[PDB]
From Swiss-Prot, chain B:
It is an enzyme of class 3 (hydrolase). This is Three-prime repair exonuclease 1. The lineage of its organism: Eukaryota, Metazoa, Chordata, Craniata, Vertebrata. Homodimer. Interacts (via proline-rich region) with TCERG1/CA150 (via the second WW domain). Component of the SET complex, composed of at least ANP32A, APEX1, HMGB2, NME1, SET and TREX1. Within this complex, directly interacts with SET; this interaction does not result in TREX1 inhibition. Also interacts with NME1, but only following translocation to the nucleus. Directly interacts with UBQLN1 (via ubiquitin-like domain); the interaction may control TREX1 subcellular location. Calcium, lithium and sodium inhibit the exonuclease activity but not the DNA binding. Mg(2+) 1 binds at D14, E16, D189. The active site is at H184 (proton donor/acceptor). Substrate binds at E16, A17, Y125, D189.
Amino acid sequence: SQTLPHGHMQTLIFLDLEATGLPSSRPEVTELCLLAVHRRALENTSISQGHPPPVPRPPRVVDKLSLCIAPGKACSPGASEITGLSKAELEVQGRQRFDDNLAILLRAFLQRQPQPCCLVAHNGDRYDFPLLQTELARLSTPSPLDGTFCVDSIAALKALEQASGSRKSYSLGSIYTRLYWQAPTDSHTAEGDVLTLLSICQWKPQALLQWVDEHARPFSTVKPMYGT
Amino acid sequence: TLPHGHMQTLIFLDLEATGLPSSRPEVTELCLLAVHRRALENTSISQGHPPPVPRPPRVVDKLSLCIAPGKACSPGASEITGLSKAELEVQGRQRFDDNLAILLRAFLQRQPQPCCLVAHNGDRYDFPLLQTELARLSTPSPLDGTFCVDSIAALKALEQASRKSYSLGSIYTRLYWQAPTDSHTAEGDVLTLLSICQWKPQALLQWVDEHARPFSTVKPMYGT
Ligand SMILES: O=c1ccn([C@@H]2O[C@H](COP(=O)(O)O)[C@@H](O)[C@H]2O)c(=O)[nH]1
């Protein structure tokens, strides 16, 4: 008689973004990647066996969107160094700002995915989700995420590693190296970090899906990082 | 004097589908990788033997989608692409439909113009098939102001001097003297194509500028 809050998630959308700086700087998004995987494709992953297990093979059927976005303010020195992006370079390559057409693009990508759909992002609750909420709030469209759910993979992997704890880092790279005994690739790029996150979430797919189903919350409840 | 000016965006494109042209095939996967002209011009020039495989530019836009066809894949198609109608359906993929055109239009709108599609064998397969799929929709085609070229012709010109296979894999191994290691997916084929096109990036861009033609002139593979 105990039931899930929002049903079984049929799509997980792994999400990462890069931005101009840390939250108190009121940052703007400079890169976004979404990787949509159906529940069945995740639970089709070969069981992890051995120590270390091989890095899981990404499912054959996936949908991917990766975009670079011109910010309205400069990247901090540290942000440009870590991410490899700068306002100057995004402008010389004619990247457009975060605008209504981008919301329309995002909505049409999300609409191709079976519902219910859940965003999954590492530190999403403190960074990616509030910042995306802020960017979308500036636009004239409805939120393209208004019927989409979300979860933070830090909590998920803390739970999953407990089932298999203190001053163990739950950074993306730390987890990946603990699970697979190799370093990740293309760190601090939106698509590279989404692919690393997919690999971590393919470690124990059934357990990950159960945790996500139980912890998914509506994206519409995410408080913006900062306001107009 | 170029026919349509300097191309500001190259969009590397690959389509996978249910079969060969006489079967009246339907698209099962599409990948677009949009690269600004300056990002290609910034590719390092090795001038060594062998040249290292270029790495992709930092700034790229990418779209990869799986699409449910209305007809089954041939056995050959499923073997080569790793896709099937049944599996695409069980994973809830949608057809090539109006919402997909909204998505393609919005993605294209984020690229500086003029924009040129680049596809390996695109003149005989990918471009006519895409034309057919878009023609079935109510929406006017999002590609009617876009240009296109076939990268088989490009690499024939870039390798000519002033027997060779022009399969994607053969070209990559001939240029880089190592085997490709991208996945057998639409995105894998696009990444291999990008690497080939980064072998001589200024020369590739010059050939594309000289040979770009309007996508509106591509004849559909087949008609309703
Ligand atoms: O030392 C740091 C670490 C992270 N960030 C910001 O954190 C964003 C997202 O973090 P990540 O996805 O690269 O881990 C980055 O785009 C960047 O703007 C910094 O500015 N300085």
